[PDB]
Symmetry: D2
Subunit: 295 residues, 4 copies
Amino acid sequence: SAVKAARYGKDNVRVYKVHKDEKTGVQTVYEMTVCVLLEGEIETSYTKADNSVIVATDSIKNTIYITAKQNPVTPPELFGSILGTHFIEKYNHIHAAHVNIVCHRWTRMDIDGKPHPHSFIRDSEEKRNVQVDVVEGKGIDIKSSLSGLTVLKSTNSQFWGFLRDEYTTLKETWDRILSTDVDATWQWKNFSGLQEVRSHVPKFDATWATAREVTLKTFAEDNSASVQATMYKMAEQILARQQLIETVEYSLPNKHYFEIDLSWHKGLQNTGKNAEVFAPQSDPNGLIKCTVGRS
Amino acid sequence: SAVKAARYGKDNVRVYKVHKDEKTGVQTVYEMTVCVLLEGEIETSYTKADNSVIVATDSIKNTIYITAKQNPVTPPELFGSILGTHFIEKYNHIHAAHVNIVCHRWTRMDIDGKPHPHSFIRDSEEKRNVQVDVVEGKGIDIKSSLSGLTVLKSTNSQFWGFLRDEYTTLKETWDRILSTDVDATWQWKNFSGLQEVRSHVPKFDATWATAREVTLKTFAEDNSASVQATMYKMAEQILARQQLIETVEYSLPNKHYFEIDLSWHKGLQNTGKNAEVFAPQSDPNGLIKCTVGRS
Amino acid sequence: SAVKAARYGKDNVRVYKVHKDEKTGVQTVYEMTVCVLLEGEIETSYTKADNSVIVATDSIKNTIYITAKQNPVTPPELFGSILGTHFIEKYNHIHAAHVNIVCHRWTRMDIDGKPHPHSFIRDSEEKRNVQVDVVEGKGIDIKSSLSGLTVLKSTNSQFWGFLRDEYTTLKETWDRILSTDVDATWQWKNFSGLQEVRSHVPKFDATWATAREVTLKTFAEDNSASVQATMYKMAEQILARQQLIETVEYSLPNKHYFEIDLSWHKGLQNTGKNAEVFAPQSDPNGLIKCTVGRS
Amino acid sequence: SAVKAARYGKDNVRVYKVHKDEKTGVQTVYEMTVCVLLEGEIETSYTKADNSVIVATDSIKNTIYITAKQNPVTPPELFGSILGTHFIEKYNHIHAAHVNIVCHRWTRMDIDGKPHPHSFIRDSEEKRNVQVDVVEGKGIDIKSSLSGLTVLKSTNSQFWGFLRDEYTTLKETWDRILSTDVDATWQWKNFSGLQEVRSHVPKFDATWATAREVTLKTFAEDNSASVQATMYKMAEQILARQQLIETVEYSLPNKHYFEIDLSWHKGLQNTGKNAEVFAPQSDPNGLIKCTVGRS
Ligand SMILES: O=c1[nH]c(=O)c2nn[nH]c2[nH]1
Ligand SMILES: O=c1[nH]c(=O)c2nn[nH]c2[nH]1
Ligand SMILES: O=c1[nH]c(=O)c2nn[nH]c2[nH]1
Ligand SMILES: O=c1[nH]c(=O)c2nn[nH]c2[nH]1
Ligand code: NA
Ligand code: NA
Ligand code: NA
Ligand code: NA
Ligand SMILES: [Xe]
Ligand SMILES: [Xe]
Ligand SMILES: [Xe]
Ligand SMILES: [Xe]
């Protein structure tokens, strides 16, 4: 037997950082969960019990805190690149670092119509994520994402003209509820190293904001022919607005809301044009994916 | 042996309702999860296998949908009272109905600075809840709540002057992070029946909004001496603003963020006035409760 | 305004303890999650910011560890009573302690048909719980429970003869699937204090085992007329076998498995006597409760 | 822009099947959650709103039920292969099916030392999974796994001799607790189609049982030098026992239990050889992966 692949590290490292402006008194908080996995010349720890090649996962945890202390933690694409680069430069036998970061929302509170200097609310479980792969001699690959954005529209969704055969019971419809949890990932062109990532720093927050805006607007405005058709429109627009993105991937559950026929009870009309009360279905759900790239 | 207490019903009934304004084209959605448990002269179903006394839980589910079809579902205090009253009036041998409702957020989307007519976002897992107990000959008892409101302030919290003995290691502090998930419940004076609940309908949404506003403002502005002292201030203000509330209960976890001493590494200073990077603790947590009523 | 009720403490305190037999080499592990809430003369911490009355929740956490170090942690009824008694005896102004303990399963592994001395498996998320209320001058009230015991029988359950009216669609049945998650609680007669709890120590594990055995056997063997009728039989038997129990409470979800009519597809027969493939329903669910006591 | 990759289907389809032996009266139940995603010539549904290429996800759900009705559902490797093959053979323009199956435990109850004919218990949340990729003209690729197997040993784990630098605080140890949740995957050699999968049917259950046995035994008996070294031993043995497996992958969290220094309290000794009470840590955790293949 032989080791074909190996990676190891620390998962679920929760980190909070506060920035205090001494002038204005304004404080800004960041909270993240971080995972760092390393690869390199470490096969002997598995095969020969040679621990001398292991940077202890506890040390990886320490490194995340120290790096957060000495560097900006925003945008997460930059923090992840700094963190990954550290391990490949510091340890001769480590040749790749894989850094995943989940950013949690702490939104400044508005009290009496003015922004509060040091009080925050978690408005939704929506996350902003990054995956950063730093590979010695191959640069830095960054995938940025938003996840956990849950939306619903109550009309202006249709689904008709699909394949009908002996397995089909679904009725065609020209007016349905559409609801989904959005997972959208944009993959950056490969960067040569930290200097290049630093040179593009302003684009990271701007592209996240654009991806979010395009997703929300397209969903709200498209008279949707299917989840497939609407999601493609979103991806197309993101690629048009940021030339440094190579691909856009969406993964979308179709969370079904079923009509309830109440006609058995006193002829009550609750279907088609008369539908008012629906039953949300926890499962099963449609799952629709697509990756869109450039011609 | 004897049956001392018994209740039975249907839990986790998910309900969505849409309202369509034919004039403006504006649609508004409501989504809830409902539980209804009944009590009454049903002991024989347990002791003698006499199913003739059982209103099937499947029928309870049907009733929730039918009631939602024929009545407003907002405010939830009114819907719960209608639903509970139905069972005690319809079935001679049922003498109490217990209705719990969890309302999920569907917030209208703003697209290009204007409210969209039929598109919604789930902004946070904060819930608005009601518990309604309808007891034949004893009226309607309603407890209203908000839950899952998660907040953090990065300064203006202190904790000193607590009891110190041989079990104590905690250091006194004049500047700490305070973060909690707010669960706040206000209990209404007993109502004689549906007519009286209907007469107070405008107060339900207004009091929920007030409870939310008072909680957020007090948390943000109080230079907190403890969770205990800050929560009391919140409860006091709610009781002052709505005379029809008899008691206010808060249950608050104290979600700890620990300093990380980094001085072992190159004398790095990250404690006290120099603290920037903290470790959020998933567990354990403080849990602080209080029920405040009128003199 | 006035404080009507107040309690505070530490939740989610995870504790592991190991016992090492120096003779046999056998090790036995216990793992629990503990919550301790205190009550007493503490109103001033809420109303006057008087922290001098507060035993810090951090100290409560320390106390749980120290108490686990110096005392047996099994049976949990005894550990909870020791822990609760500590606070009311140690602090003059604390008059009640409420201790909740969840015991997690670590079952000794059998390797090659023999019990391993120091290796364990988590066989199921079933828990054994206790709630202990220690109230100065009123003794010790203990509720013991099992929860998270998930069972299913594929036949020998019926449900017919229930009330039928204009809200009813459910068909009567003489053969259905019955599946539930068992939550069963037995409440002990009040104990005068620790000496009395200590005198009954052997009964705690034995009664837990009996409650478990009676639940499983009755479920498997009863040709069930309803959840109500089967659960009553369980409770009756537990009360008969342990005279020191005053009441038995069961809370049981009815987790539905629906037939799937496939007759639309090539006349395929999958209902009634021909039913083979079913759709488990995540929600809604029936919820059936009963508390049984002595004549 | 262009579609680079696309797949779509139905997730979270819960399925139960019962087998009734008319002779013995014995019933056996199977419960699974199934996901099926399809790929093929479907780009136009995304780019041109051409729904004529879409097999509706609702039809995919119907197909899973019908296939379960007409075929054995065990072993899951066979069921998944039947299900995947159906879609690529039935629909000309569908060229790949990806089938994931999670099998839930329903273990026959022993009542009074004998196996009950129709009553079952969920003993643990351990799952048996399969991933089956059926690709037109490329055969059937099957990955089998077990997950959610949670174990702990209280001694006979060590960790010393790791890299020490200015980021390191971890002390070397010769006696620690080791606890993990096991995720183990074995990848079968590619099969040419259903006939070949059918010919190997007896190997699937046997190899699952062997993988489980080897994991448990090795964990219990190895005087572990690290998670890395112990996991390699497991993988090596599985590859030796089943020649039709090409690779074995393990992914193992290292769930930490920390010593608690109690010496501040009356000189209480609870560290090193005196350690009895530990604090389980919910996060962070080590994460250790390896893929082992043949020379
Ligand atoms: O078994 C271990 N492997 C590791 O890589 C490690 N790092 N810290 N502790 C550890 N334990
Ligand atoms: O056992 C049952 N009890 C009930 O109360 C009920 N209601 N619907 N189905 C049911 N099954
Ligand atoms: O606000 C607080 N209240 C308390 O009771 C407490 N105990 N430890 N820390 C604390 N903080
Ligand atoms: O938008 C949809 N896409 C699909 O593929 C599908 N299948 N059933 N319903 C559906 N709705
Ligand atoms: Na390197
Ligand atoms: Na009545
Ligand atoms: Na006392
Ligand atoms: Na095909
Ligand atoms: Xe952070
Ligand atoms: Xe609703
Ligand atoms: Xe414990
Ligand atoms: Xe199944």
